[PDB]
Structures are given as C-alpha cells and as structure tokens.
Amino acid sequence: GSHMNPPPPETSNPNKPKRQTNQLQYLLRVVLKTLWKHQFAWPFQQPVDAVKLNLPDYYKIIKTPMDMGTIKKRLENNYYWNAQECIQDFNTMFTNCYIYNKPGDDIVLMAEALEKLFLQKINELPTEE
Numbered sequence: 400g401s402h403m404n405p406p407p408p409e410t411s412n413p414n415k416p417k418r419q420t421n422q423l424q425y426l427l428r429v430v431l432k433t434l435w436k437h438q439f440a441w442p443f444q445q446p447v448d449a450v451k452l453n454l455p456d457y458y459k460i461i462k463t464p465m466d467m468g469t470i471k472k473r474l475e476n477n478y479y480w481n482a483q484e485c486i487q488d489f490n491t492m493f494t495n496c497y498i499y500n501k502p503g504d505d506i507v508l509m510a511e512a513l514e515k516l517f518l519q520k521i522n523e524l525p526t527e528e
C-alpha cells in the first residue's frame with residue numbers, strides 16, 4: 400500500500416525462536432476467535448490506514464502500532480515463544496487506541512468492550528503445561 404503508511408509488524412522471521420504452548424493454543428482458539436468475531440472487531444482487524452482515514456499524524460503519535468490481523472497471523476504462523484508476547488501485543492493495540500482517541504469516542508467505547516472480553520478470557524488462561 401501507500402508509502403506514507405509504515406510497514407506492518409513482522410509476522411515471520413526464521414531467526415526468532417518459536418514454540419507452541421497450550422497457552423498460545425488457547426490464545427488462538429479461544430481468545431482471538433472470540434474477539435475476531437465480535438460486533439466491534441472490525442476497526443481492529445487490520446493496520447490503521449492513516450492515508451485512507453486522513454489522519455496524517457497517526458504514525459507521528461503511535462510508534463508501536465499493533466492490530467488483531469497482525470496478532471492472528473502471528474498466532475497462525477507460530478511466531479511467539481510464549482503467551483506473554485501475545486498478551487503484550489493485545490495490550491499495545493488497546494493502549495494505542497486510548498492514546499490516539501478521546502474518552503468519549505466511539506472507537507474507544509468499542510475498544511473498551513473488546514478489552515473487557517479479552518481480560519475475562521485472560522482470567523481463564525490455563526497454566527502452561
């Protein structure tokens with residue numbers, strides 16, 4: 400896409416050690432599945448296209464972009480070594496939305512609904528086995 404949007408986060412790298420764990424399987428099969436299909440998922444399912452949204456300051460503000468499309472590819476590609484890496488990616492996606500936008504805002508209300516569901520699912524994350 401546009402040269403004015405940054406390259407998206409890495410989803411493949413042969414140099415990075417990778418593992419499947421039961422927690423990571425849970426994050427794909429339960430957590431990501433549940434959030435992906437939620438009514439309010441759609442603004443988070445791909446990187447922010449700052450050109451299409453006419454937000455030329457977006458990547459001036461947000462220097463650690465993350466989206467659930469990236470997270471889904473990372474899980475499907477077995478990119479992570481542990482669950483914490485993937486939980487941190489979800490936390491970074493929510494925080495970016497709250498930093499860029501204002502407490503009133505539609506997208507913030509949507510992210511807050513998704514975050515509440517994500518935290519309920521993390522409360523049920525199994526012990527690593």
Ligand SMILES: CC(=O)N1CCC[C@@H]1C(=O)NCC#CBr
Binds near residue numbers: 443452500506
């Ligand atoms: C980080 C963030 O803002 N996000 C995540 C999803 C897209 C959203 C955004 O920028 N546009 C939505 C509205 C308004 Br103005």
